[PDB]
Amino acid sequence: SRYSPEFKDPLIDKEYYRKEEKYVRELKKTQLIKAAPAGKTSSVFEDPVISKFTNMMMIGGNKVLARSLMIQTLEAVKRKQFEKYHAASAEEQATIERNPYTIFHQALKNCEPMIGLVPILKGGRFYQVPVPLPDRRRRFLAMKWMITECRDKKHQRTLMPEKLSHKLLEAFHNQGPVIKRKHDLHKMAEANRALAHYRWW
C-alpha cells in the first residue's frame, strides 16, 4: 500500500546474517529494502510468540500496558515456580521446570488442536465438518481461546494477571477450561466424522 511493491521485508536473525546462499544474498543486495518495524528487535529476549501475544491482548493501541501486564504475568509464573522449587524435595525439584517461557510454550502447544470444524452448506441446513487447520491458524486460535478463557465476567473481582497465570499453569499439563473444551471439540469432530464427504477443498 504505502511502501512501493519493490520493497521487501528484512529478516532479523543476526546469527543468520553473520557468516546458492551467496547468490540469493547478492540478489537481495541488488534489491531494495524498507524500514524495519518498531515491534521486532534483534535482541535475544523476544520471539514472535510473545509478539503475537502482546499484539492480541493489547486493546486501543496500549502496547505499553499490554507488555507491562505480560511481564507481570511472567513474573507471577516465575514466582509460583520458585515457590514450587523451594517447597519441593530435591528429587521433585530435579523434575520441576521453572522457565515461564517454556511453560507458556508448552501450555500453548498442548492447547492447540490439530483439527477444526468448518460450517458447510447443504440444502437449507449448515453442518459442521472436520477439517485440518494450518499452523498459523491453529496458533491464532489457541492464543485467542486461552486469552478469552482467561478474561471473563465470572471472576470479575480477581485480577487477570494471576487468573491467567493459574490458567497457564493448569494448561501446562492438559488441564483447564481450554483443555476441556478442546476435548469437547475433538468429541464434536468424532460426532461429525461421517460428514467429511461434504468438503470439496
Partner: protein
C-alpha cells in the same frame, strides 16, 4: 559475591553480598521496605543485602561521630530508582547491631496522602487527626522494639479523656498499649511519645536514631480537602505539625537520617531528583545545612557481582541469557539503574 561479615564492612571488596537473619528481618525492619521488594525477598527465601559505596561512606561517618556535637542530619538522594532507601535500611541494621533506639517510619507519602478518615483533636486545637496511621506506626514501633520501652521511664504524666491517666516512673509500653487498644487518641499518643523521646536530653541509657523514607512528602502540600470543599495545608495535620516541631537538632545526641523518593512525589514533575528541587524553599529553611549523599547507579564490577548473585540464586531461568551479548544488551537497556534492573531480571 557473598560476604561472611554482615555487621562489619570494608571498602576493599565492593559489590559483595552479606546474609542476614530472619529475626533481624522481622524485628529490626518489618515495615521499612517497599512491598514489592518485601515480597521479592520473601520469594528469595534467602535474605542477602549488597554493599554500596555511599552506604560504606555513611557508615564511616557514623563510626567517626561524636555525640557532644549537635544532632547531625543526613539526606540520601538518588535518581528515582537507586538504592538510597535500601542503604538507609542498611544503616538501620548497623545501628541496631550497635544497640541504639531506632525509630523508623515506612513513608511520609502514606501520612500526607491516602487517609481513610482525616477530626477535631481534643488534646490540641486547630489540628486534624491521623488516628489509623498513628496506631499503625505505634504498633510498628512496638514490633520494632522492648527493653527500651520498659526502661524509658518517662519523667512526666499524661491525662486522657478515657477517665484515666499515666503517672511518673511508668514505661511508655502502657501508652503504646493505650493507642493499640483505642485508635482515636492514638494520634495524641504518638505526638506525645515523640516529644517524650526528646524530653530525655541526656540520652545516656540509649542513643536515639530517626529514620525517614520519602522525606519529600514531609515538605509539600496535601491532596486532602475539607468537607466544605476547601484545601488542607500540610502544617495543619497533626502528625505533620508534630514531626516538624519535633525534629529540630535540639536533642544533640547523635544523628538522624532521611531519604528522598520521587516515585511517590506529589505535585512534582517526573525526572526531578535534586535535593533542593525535592525539599523546596521551606525545606532549605527548615534545615539549611545537612549531609547530602548522592546515591549513584551501580558500578561495573558491582553490577557483575549482582548478576553473579542472581545466577547463584538461579533467578534468571532463561539459560541463554548468561552470555556476553545477553549481558551487554541487558546493562545497555538498563543503564545500571537498580530498579529497572530488578524489574528486568524479574520478568526475564
Amino acid at each position: 559475591t557473598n560476604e561472611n561479615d554482615p555487621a562489619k564492612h570494608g571498602d576493599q571488596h565492593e559489590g559483595q553480598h552479606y546474609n542476614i537473619s530472619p529475626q533481624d528481618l522481622e524485628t529490626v525492619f518489618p515495615h521499612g521496605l517497599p512491598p514489592r521488594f518485601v515480597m521479592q525477598v520473601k520469594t528469595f527465601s534467602e535474605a542477602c543485602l549488597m554493599v554500596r559505596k555511599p552506604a560504606l561512606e555513611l557508615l564511616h561517618y557514623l563510626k567517626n561521630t561524636s555525640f557532644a556535637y549537635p544532632a547531625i542530619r543526613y539526606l540520601l538522594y538518588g535518581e528515582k530508582g537507586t538504592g538510597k532507601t535500601l542503604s538507609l535500611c542498611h544503616v538501620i541494621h548497623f545501628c541496631a547491631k550497635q544497640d541504639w533506639l531506632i525509630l523508623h517510619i515506612p513513608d511520609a507519602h502514606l501520612w500526607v496522602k491516602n487517609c481513610r478518615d482525616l477530626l477535631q483533636s481534643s488534646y490540641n486545637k486547630q489540628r486534624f487527626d491521623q488516628p489509623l496511621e498513628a496506631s499503625t506506626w505505634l504498633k510498628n514501633f512496638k514490633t520494632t522494639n522492648e527493653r527500651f520501652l520498659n526502661q524509658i521511664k518517662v519523667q512526666e504524666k499524661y491525662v486522657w479523656n478515657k477517665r484515666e491517666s499515666t503517672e511518673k516512673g511508668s514505661p511508655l509500653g502502657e501508652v503504646v498499649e493505650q493507642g493499640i487498644t483505642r485508635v482515636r487518641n492514638a494520634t495524641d499518643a504518638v505526638g506525645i511519645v515523640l516529644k517524650e523521646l526528646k524530653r530525655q536530653s541526656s540520652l545516656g541509657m540509649f542513643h536515639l536514631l530517626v529514620a525517614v523514607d520519602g522525606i519529600n512528602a514531609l515538605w509539600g502540600r496535601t491532596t486532602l480537602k475539607r468537607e466544605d470543599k476547601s484545601p488542607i495545608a500540610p502544617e495543619e495535620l497533626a502528625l505533620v505539625h508534630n514531626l516538624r516541631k519535633m525534629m529540630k537538632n535540639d536533642w544533640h545526641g547523635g544523628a538522624i537520617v532521611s531519604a528522598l523518593s520521587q516515585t511517590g512525589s506529589l505535585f512534582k514533575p517526573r525526572k526531578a531528583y535534586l535535593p533542593q528541587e525535592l525539599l523546596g524553599k521551606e525545606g532549605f529553611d527548615a534545615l539549611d545545612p545537612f549531609i547530602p549523599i548522592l546515591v549513584s547507579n551501580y558500578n561495573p564490577k558491582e553490577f557483575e557481582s549482582c548478576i553473579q548473585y542472581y545466577l547463584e540464586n538461579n533467578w534468571l531461568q532463561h539459560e541463554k541469557a548468561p552470555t556476553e551479548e545477553g549481558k551487554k544488551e541487558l546493562l545497555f537497556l538498563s543503564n545500571a539503574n537498580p530498579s529497572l534492573l530488578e524489574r528486568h531480571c524479574a520478568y526475564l
